[PDB]
């Protein structure tokens, strides 16, 4: 049981082979969830499940630079369910973040922010009960 929004420091930023694991439960009637991997005020990787965008469920990913959102990356697969426990794993690889939900690969997001070792915070927010947030090197 962690308070949301939660900040997970990433000391010395991220690096390939770093695995971030988030455990929680989606609230009933959730509207959205967000993971924000931040480089100072910039958002290197925003991962944003939306439960009701024009009555569709979609995950939006993007980068924020100098307070400007870039071009969104959207795909169709939506593994979250209101009221249910989830696991998000974010594995940093050399050219992308690799995301799996509930042990199934979901998406990749290519690195736009190049200075990986300055992406030194993960913010976790939105309509979840957050159980734990941690990292390990694999
Ligand atoms: C298929 O359907 C669509 C569509 F319907 C669209 F509208 C778009 C379109 O691009 N929509 C974007 C457009 O309307 C743009 C214009 O400013 O605004 C973004 S919204 C923006 O999108 C960003 C990523 O590009 C962020 O997701 C951003 N959200 C947050 O900052 C945010 C959040 F994600 C949270 F989860 C959150 O609380 C947990 C919160 F407080 C937030 F502020 C969020 O800002 S907020 O909705 O005002 O909060 C739309 O996605 C689209 F591409 C599609 F493909």
Q: Which residues line ligand 1 (CB under 6 A)?
A: 32, 34, 46, 48, 53-54, 60, 62, 69, 72, 74, 125-126
Ligand 1 center to residue 138 CA distance, Å? 33
What domains, with CATH codes, occur in the chain?
Answer: 1-138 (2.60.120.200)
The closest of 92, 89, 99 to 13, measured between CA atoms, is 92
- Rounded to whole angstroms, the Cα distance separating 12 from 5 reads 22
Nearest CA to ligand 1 atom 43: 34
Give this entry's resolution in angstroms: 1.0
The closest of 130, 26, 126 to 83, measured between CA atoms, is 26
Which technique was used to obtain these atomic coordinates?
A: X-ray
The helix/strand/coil state of 23 is strand
Ligand 1 center to residue 24 CA distance, Å? 23
Known binding residue 13? Answer is: no
- Rounded to whole angstroms, the Cα distance separating 35 from 6 reads 10
């Amino acid at each position: 049981a962690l308070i949301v929004p939660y900040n997970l420091p990433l000391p010395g930023g991220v690096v390939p082979r770093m695995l971030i694991t988030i455990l929680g439960t989606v609230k009933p009637n959730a509207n959205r969830i967000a993971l924000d991997f931040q480089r100072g005020n910039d958002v290197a990787f925003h991962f944003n499940p939306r439960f009701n965008e024009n009555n569709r469920r979609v995950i939006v990913c993007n980068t924020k630079l100098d307070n400007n959102w870039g071009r969104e990356e959207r795909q169709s697969v939506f593994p979250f369910e209101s009221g249910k426990p989830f696991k998000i794993q974010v594995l940093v690889e050399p050219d992308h973040f690799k995301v799996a939900v509930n042990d199934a690969h979901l998406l990749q997001y290519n690195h736009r922010v190049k200075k990986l070792n300055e992406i030194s915070k993960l913010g976790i927010s939105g309509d979840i009960d957050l159980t734990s947030a941690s990292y390990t090197m694999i």
